[PDB]
Amino acid sequence: GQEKLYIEKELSWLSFNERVLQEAADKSNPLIERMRFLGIYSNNLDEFYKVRFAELKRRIIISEEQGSNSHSRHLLGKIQSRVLKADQEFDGLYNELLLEMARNQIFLINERQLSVNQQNWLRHYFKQYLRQHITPILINPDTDLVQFLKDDYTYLAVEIIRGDTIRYALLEIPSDKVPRFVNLPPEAPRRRKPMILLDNILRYCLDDIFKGFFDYDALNAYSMKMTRDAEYDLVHEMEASLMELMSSSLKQRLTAEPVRFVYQRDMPNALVEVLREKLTISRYDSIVPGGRYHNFKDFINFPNVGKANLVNKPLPRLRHIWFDKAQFRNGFDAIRERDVLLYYPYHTFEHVLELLRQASFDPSVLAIKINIYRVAKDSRIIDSMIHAAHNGKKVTVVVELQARFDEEANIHWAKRLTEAGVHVIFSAPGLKIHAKLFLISRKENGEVVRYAHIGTGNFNEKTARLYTDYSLLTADARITNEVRRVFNFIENPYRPVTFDYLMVSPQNSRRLLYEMVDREIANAQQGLPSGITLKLNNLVDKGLVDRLYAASSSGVPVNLLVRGMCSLIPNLEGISDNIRAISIVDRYLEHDRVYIFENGGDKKVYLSSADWMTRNIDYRIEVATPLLDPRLKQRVLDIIDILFSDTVKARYIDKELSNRYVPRGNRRKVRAQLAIYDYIKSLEQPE
Amino acid sequence: GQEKLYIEKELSWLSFNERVLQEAADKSNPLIERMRFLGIYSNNLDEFYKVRFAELKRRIIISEEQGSNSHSRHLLGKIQSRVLKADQEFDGLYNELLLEMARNQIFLINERQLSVNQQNWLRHYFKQYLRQHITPILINPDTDLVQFLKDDYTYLAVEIIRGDTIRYALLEIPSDKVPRFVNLPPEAPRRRKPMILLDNILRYCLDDIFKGFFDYDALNAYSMKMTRDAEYDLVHEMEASLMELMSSSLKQRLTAEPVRFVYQRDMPNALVEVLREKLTISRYDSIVPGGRYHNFKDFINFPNVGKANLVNKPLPRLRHIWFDKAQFRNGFDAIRERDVLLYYPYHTFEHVLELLRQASFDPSVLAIKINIYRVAKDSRIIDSMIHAAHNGKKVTVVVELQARFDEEANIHWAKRLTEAGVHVIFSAPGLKIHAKLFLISRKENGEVVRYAHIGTGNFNEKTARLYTDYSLLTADARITNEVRRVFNFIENPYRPVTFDYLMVSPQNSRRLLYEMVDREIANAQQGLPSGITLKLNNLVDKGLVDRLYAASSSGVPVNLLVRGMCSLIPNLEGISDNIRAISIVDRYLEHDRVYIFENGGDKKVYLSSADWMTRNIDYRIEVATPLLDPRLKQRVLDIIDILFSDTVKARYIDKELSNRYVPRGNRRKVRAQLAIYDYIKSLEQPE
Numbered sequence A, B: 001g002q003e004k005l006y007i008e009k010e011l012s013w014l015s016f017n018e019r020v021l022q023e024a025a026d027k028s029n030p031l032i033e034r035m036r037f038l039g040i041y042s043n044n045l046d047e048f049y050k051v052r053f054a055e056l057k058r059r060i061i062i063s064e065e066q067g068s069n070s071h072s073r074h075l076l077g078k079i080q081s082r083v084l085k086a087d088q089e090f091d092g093l094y095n096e097l098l099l100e101m102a103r104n105q106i107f108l109i110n111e112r113q114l115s116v117n118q119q120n121w122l123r124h125y126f127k128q129y130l131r132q133h134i135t136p137i138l139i140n141p142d143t144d145l146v147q148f149l150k151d152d153y154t155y156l157a158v159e160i161i162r163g164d165t166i167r168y169a170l171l172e173i174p175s176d177k178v179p180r181f182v183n184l185p186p187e188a189p190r191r192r193k194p195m196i197l198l199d200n201i202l203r204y205c206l207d208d209i210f211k212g213f214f215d216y217d218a219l220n221a222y223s224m225k226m227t228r229d230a231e232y233d234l235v236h237e238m239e240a241s242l243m244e245l246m247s248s249s250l251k252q253r254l255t256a257e258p259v260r261f262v263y264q265r266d267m268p269n270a271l272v273e274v275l276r277e278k279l280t281i282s283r284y285d286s287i288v289p290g291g292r293y294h295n296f297k298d299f300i301n302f303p304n305v306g307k308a309n310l311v312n313k314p315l316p317r318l319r320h321i322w323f324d325k326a327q328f329r330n331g332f333d334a335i336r337e338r339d340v341l342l343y344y345p346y347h348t349f350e351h352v353l354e355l356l357r358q359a360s361f362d363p364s365v366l367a368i369k370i371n372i373y374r375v376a377k378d379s380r381i382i383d384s385m386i387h388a389a390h391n392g393k394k395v396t397v398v399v400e401l402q403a404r405f406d407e408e409a410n411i412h413w414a415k416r417l418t419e420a421g422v423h424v425i426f427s428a429p430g431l432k433i434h435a436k437l438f439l440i441s442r443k444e445n446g447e448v449v450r451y452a453h454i455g456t457g458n459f460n461e462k463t464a465r466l467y468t469d470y471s472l473l474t475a476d477a478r479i480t481n482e483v484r485r486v487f488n489f490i491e492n493p494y495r496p497v498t499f500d501y502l503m504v505s506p507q508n509s510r511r512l513l514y515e516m517v518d519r520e521i522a523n524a525q526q527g528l529p530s531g532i533t534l535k536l537n538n539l540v541d542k543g544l545v546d547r548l549y550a551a552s553s554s555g556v557p558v559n560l561l562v563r564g565m566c567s568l569i570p571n572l573e574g575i576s577d578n579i580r581a582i583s584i585v586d587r588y589l590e591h592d593r594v595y596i597f598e599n600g601g602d603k604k605v606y607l608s609s610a611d612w613m614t615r616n617i618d619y620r621i622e623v624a625t626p627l628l629d630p631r632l633k634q635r636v637l638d639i640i641d642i643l644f645s646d647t648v649k650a651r652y653i654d655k656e657l658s659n660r661y662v663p664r665g666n667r668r669k670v671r672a673q674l675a676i677y678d679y680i681k682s683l684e685q686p687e
Helices: A009-025 A031-064 A072-103 A118-133 A198-210 A241-245 A248-255 A269-278 A296-301 A331-337 A350-359 A380-390 A415-420 A477-491 A510-524 A542-553 A614-619 A630-644 A672-683 B009-025 B031-064 B072-103 B118-133 B198-210 B241-245 B248-255 B269-278 B296-301 B331-337 B350-359 B380-390 B415-420 B477-491 B510-524 B542-553 B614-618 B630-644 B672-683
Strands: A106-109 A154-162 A165-172 A181-183 A193-197 A218-228 A259-263 A286-289 A340-343 A365-372 A394-399 A423-426 A436-444 A447-455 A470-474 A503-505 A532-536 A558-562 A579-584 A593-597 A604-608 A622-626 A650-652 B106-109 B154-162 B165-172 B181-183 B193-197 B218-228 B259-263 B286-289 B340-343 B365-372 B394-399 B423-426 B436-444 B447-455 B470-474 B503-505 B532-536 B558-562 B579-584 B593-597 B604-608 B622-626 B650-652
Touching (some): A009 A031, A009 A072, A031 A218, A031 A248, A031 A296, A072 A106, A118 A198, A118 B350, A154 A198, A154 A269, A165 A198, A165 A269, A181 A198, A198 A218, A269 A286, A331 A350, A331 A447, A340 A630, A350 A436, A350 A447, A350 A470, A350 B118, A365 A380, A380 A394, A380 A415, A394 A477, A447 A477, A470 A477, A503 A614, A510 A542, A510 A593, A542 A558, A558 A630, A593 A630, A604 A630, A630 A672, B009 B031, B031 B072, B031 B218, B031 B296, B072 B106, B154 B198, B154 B269, B165 B198, B181 B198, B193 B198, B198 B218, B259 B269, B269 B286, B331 B350, B350 B365, B350 B380, B350 B436, B350 B447, B365 B380, B365 B477, B394 B477, B436 B477, B470 B477, B503 B614, B510 B542, B510 B593, B542 B558, B558 B630, B593 B630, B630 B672
Parallel strands (some): A106 A193, A259 A286, A365 A394, A394 A423, B106 B193, B259 B286, B365 B394, B558 B579
Antiparallel strands (some): A154 A218, A181 A193, A340 A470, A436 A447, A503 A622, A579 A650, A593 A604, B154 B165, B154 B218, B218 B259, B340 B470, B365 B436, B447 B470, B503 B622, B532 B593, B579 B650
């Protein structure tokens, strides 16, 4: 190690969540929206430790065992140094925001700050609404918190003192059943909006919770929280001579998933100890003191007790007028006529859902093939496939059984189908189909005509609204056959398969990408117009990054738009002098990755679902589509223009991880995510 | 057969549901409440055919096979003659009520009566809300409605006409997902409240549902509904030499559960035929034409678009102040102090639920035994038993696995418990524990003290509110030990067991009842004061009835209050000259049966859960409790007084099944179910 050629993705990520914090600070966002961001920020860091950080640990360990060769503990340090520095910054904001909220007449107060009236109000409220959910868990020598104790929940450790006697009991903050923020009755000026945390209501009612059956001189409560690291598995597909030589002392010290125990700073050491034991806090397990509150994630639902101004105004999802043209009898005619490209959340997912409902009873529809990844809870699509089954249609449904977090939510999504006449097909052990396709075939007088759907993100009717994704609808055989192939590839991957238009992970990808970059590089070494323009969530894969460094050094211009991690360092004398990269963190979540290559003058524009990360190129099922229709190719190009024209949310990506905001020169003030809406909105104006 | 000594229970029942209809007619009830009654009436008759009537069939058949000896087909006739006569009466009311509703500015109109504006309104409404739930089921030669077709749902059979061509398709009225009554926008006077049936919206949009993929000159829709008879099993416990000799032609013709097919009168015979087949309508299956609408049961939720007046005013459930007395530290002290008797729905079930939540963490609570019959969906009691488990408490839970209709809802209520430390105990094949007890033991300084709960109805937190039930809470060992025994009896019934205070079905009952009646009879044949006063839901059991006839003829006075069936004929010269019986059908449902015997002068008062019906005395687990506390014994006596003092809802029971209303002589105007409230209300006034 000498002069960083790339940026550690884990550090790049910290910087990414920091950009998220900038949203909490950014005064241009409504007050309540900023509060909620704090929740996003927290929930992210939460997943950071549960997954990505736990992953890094292992790698650094896997390194050790027999041959660790990366300045790992120097990175670990940098990591927690950025985190601590952040935590103190988080603390600043929360304070600032608390003040600001008060200015707007809202007051998040604690049990000690109650009025000699609200007190009597709470007690009543508690006995009439909360009590039933709050039942002491007694800590006895045989009680084994180990099991029944809820993972990631907040608990209140109660200290029951009677003389030199001390009994211990737990109180679960029921954040699931009851709202975590309760509005107290306005003391004097009816203007004020006072609220208290559910945690502090309990803290305030400890006596009413225990006096009925316990004798004590005093009661003390301290909060604590316990979290387990995520599940491992995909790291042995390299441990050739490693996992083989790897000693049992390391397999046990690598498989065993640790436990993090967090407790309020002033919890009497005796109680901490009591828990250290009851919670099997062994060697590899972590014990950390700190704070009265945990689960700041719960701020993602901070209610809004002010005027609408304090909250973002919801944009109505738009109908793509094309589907409505009276010259179209139905959805299949609209698509047969022209390739249709929808962009969520500006458009309603309601079209794809209408289409699928049609195919389920349209006499001409012969079959339907479609995959169920991480869709919305209890899909309305499932019901449709059932109808199609009941109406004939050869219905084929692929269900992957292990996503990133929405895994066990597709192990039930099956026994049902089969019974009605559906051919169900499960993905291998832990394989992820991050693409979301569906193929529909229908006898259109004599001939069979296939209509496919290629969706960059997933069928989640919840994902369309917080995420921005594409949805291509086509009858173009060039693309149609390719989707058909994809589904075949899934059912029988043992059989050789090739794709001429789609980029399919992990069949081509690497090859298909290297090859496109290598061509721009070629045209650049010939002085022709070249260009690489990517819009990804993460740019990390070693190979792909170097491939870009190469493009830059060969004169090829590269414009990146990565909202998350970016191990690529832009502006490196002789390495990446022609690579400009920014990040836009706004309301919505980018779920759509694009690829745009100059390819001489005839630009190739791909809509993908994969980030330039190793796991997305070589280990999961991903799909990227070229836009054969120049009309649609253009639309995507405009949108990408609005994006790179942002001067409100865009930030620079530098080898300094500064997250500075792109300055608006004499150029216009643009906020992509909003301009994008007006762009779409203008497309749906009566022809 | 000559001079009916008893009344056929099936006829008595028809008369009972007729009393229910009288509620729909009774102008003293708010308009919307009367509408909803029509639904009750319908839902009842619905269950009448699914169960009781299907049961009678079998008996009459079981009679046949080798030896049928009851004027069965003479009864069948009487049965459907009362039903037809009723149906025509039902029709009258509905019409009258429809008129009355209009007077109040409400108009339930059909698709043909829409305005040339609401039409355009519906279509829009349909495409934006209903469409997604309405997907044509195409009827093809291979389609087998047989399976996937929903039982008891309403379907619209659509006729697609194109030349001399006719295609058939089904449309399911989605009463489960969408409200069955939609409010249309007021045409001219803003006063009017126009609404249409969901069935008729479809009927009106047939074109918008099919034009997209079908070519036709016309579309016709006709409603139909299919119902299956309930499940059989408890009739072979007598077929000694019967079931044995019984021929396979009868076991097959007796087990096989028929299917009832109902269709709109004018459905083209071709379509009826199409369905006769698709629906495997075999021999024993029933096919019946009639009406545009089915499922009148859906009227139990008829919305109220008028002023509160049109709906019954909800009485707030009262706290039993006794549990609140400051001299009581907790629930166990209130009960240890005095036997506590709660009467629902006047009181909140909230006490029993508070008590159970305490026992789950009260250090002195050692164990808890309790049964899970037909409780409310996802019990809050289950969670409590889990805590108790987690807190030590030897928790024992009995789960019967087959109730009358809430059966499979207790097959899941288990795997959960065991895991946490709960001793689960399942009831035999099809055994019903219609009692609802729980025993709690707690070390009260040295000694162990048991507190039991004896509930006449079930733990259903839904049942407490439409039903009127008792709930006795006591620490009296005389009763405590007896409950303890009950639970033991359940766990090990193979072991001999005896009860000295509780009436337990089917251990004593018969004996315990015969014996009490026989004693009054004795005191009556000695000129002493005797009396039998029952409050039941049904008085049918042969033996018990004759036992009463005997009491009457021996001079013993008998006062019956049966809301449902009553095979006993009151006022039979020389048979039942001293038996006065009435029925009160009001808002609430009687789920509390009492028993009261004069017993010399020292009256015995029992609170039971069993009706005087054979299945409740000899085949199910029932529990009746004597009221050892004279204070509580008195309260029940007052309530029973208010009841028999009713002169608003009380009806006479006669051998004419006239359902005449008890006339208010110069006596006061009383409405028990309301007076009962004021009685309780007065008991909870600050001491």
